[PDB]
Amino acid sequence: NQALLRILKETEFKKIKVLGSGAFGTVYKGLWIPEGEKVKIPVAIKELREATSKANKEILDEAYVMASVDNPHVCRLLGICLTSTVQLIMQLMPFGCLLDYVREHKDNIGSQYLLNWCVQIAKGMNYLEDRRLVHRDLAARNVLVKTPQHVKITDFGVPIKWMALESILHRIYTHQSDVWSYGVTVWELMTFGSKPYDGIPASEISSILEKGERLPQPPICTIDVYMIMRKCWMIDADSRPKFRELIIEFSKMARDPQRYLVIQGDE
Numbered sequence: 001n002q003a004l005l006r007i008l009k010e011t012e013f014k015k016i017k018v019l020g021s022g023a024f025g026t027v028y029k030g031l032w033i034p035e036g037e038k039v040k041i042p043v044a045i046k047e048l049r050e051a052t053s054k055a056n057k058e059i060l061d062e063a064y065v066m067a068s069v070d071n072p073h074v075c076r077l078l079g080i081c082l083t084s085t086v087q088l089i090m091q092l093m094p095f096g097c098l099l100d101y102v103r104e105h106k107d108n109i110g111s112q113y114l115l116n117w118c119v120q121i122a123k124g125m126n127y128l129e130d131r132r133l134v135h136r137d138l139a140a141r142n143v144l145v146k147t148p149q150h151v152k153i154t155d156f157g158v159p160i161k162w163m164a165l166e167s168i169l170h171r172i173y174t175h176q177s178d179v180w181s182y183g184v185t186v187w188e189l190m191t192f193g194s195k196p197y198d199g200i201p202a203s204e205i206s207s208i209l210e211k212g213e214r215l216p217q218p219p220i221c222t223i224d225v226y227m228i229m230r231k232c233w234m235i236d237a238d239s240r241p242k243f244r245e246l247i248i249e250f251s252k253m254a255r256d257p258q259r260y261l262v263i264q265g266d267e
């Protein structure tokens with residue numbers, strides 16, 4: 001349905017505070033105040049940087065897809081405002097991005113939380129695959145925390161250190177290159193937000209991968225968890241797991257979390 005996407009008037013939303021900013025734009029915490037309603041809805045508003053040159057119809061075409069996603073672990077576009085800039089409106093995710101959440105809360109994050117996040121991210125990615133949507137930038141920074149045990153993928157619709165080798169070398173992006181990025185994302189979570197290949201120039205990463213080197217086993221990970229991660233980083237894209245398999249395997253591990261992760265204080 002085109003009814004799934006609200007075209008917002010400028011009076012219908014208000015930017016109140018800054019949530020974050022970067023080269024691509026600024027995200028604000030604000031309020032959606034729909035006309036003819038009696039409510040004020042907390043939202044996040046991303047204002048993209050103004051472009052010197054796509055056409056409004058093509059933008060709306062893409063926005064409709066983002067408004068059509070229907071899965072508890074993928075963000076949905078609630079509204080759009082087209083002016084000199086593109087502004088994207090979606091529900092506020094009050095706990096912020098998962099990367100910063102895990103860094104801030106590391107001393108209080110247990111194994112069942114970690115494995116549940118892995119399940120949820122795999123479910124959202126499997127949904128994108130069912131919709132034939134390749135993400136291209138999955139990373140812990142692009143998972144948002146609605147509540148501590150409800151997360152959602154965002155930032156879809158160059159991150160060399162998350163990229164599959166065939167994306168770096170040949171600009172090939174597929175669901176299987178997203179699986180590589182998923183493995184790096186899991187590595188970020190299991191290290192409580194460490195930086196992959198910290199301090200290594202982006203242009204050196206392909207030679208690391210070519211030589212057969214990979215991100216190291218996080219101390220908390222048992223062999224079965226690290227083996228899943230390593231399988232996501234096979235050179236042969238079709239030898240990597242599928243997201244539907246990752247759901248099954250991490251769901252199994254989340255049923256016995258102390259078997260699969262050994263966290264600070266475990267015996």
Ligand SMILES: *CCC(=O)Nc1cc(-c2c[nH]c3ncnc(Nc4ccc(CN5C(=O)c6ccccc6C5=O)cc4)c23)ccc1OCCO
Nearest residue numbers: 019020027044046075076077088090093096097141155156
């Ligand atoms: C990890 C560092 C970080 O990202 N910080 C950071 C957090 C936020 C942030 C905090 N709470 C938020 N709630 C909701 N949304 C955002 N951010 C956000 C991201 C993307 C978009 C644009 N957008 C959509 O609207 C949409 C809809 C469907 C599918 C995909 C998308 C989509 O990508 C809007 C809002 C929250 C904001 C900014 C932050 O810092 C950024 C620079 O590090």
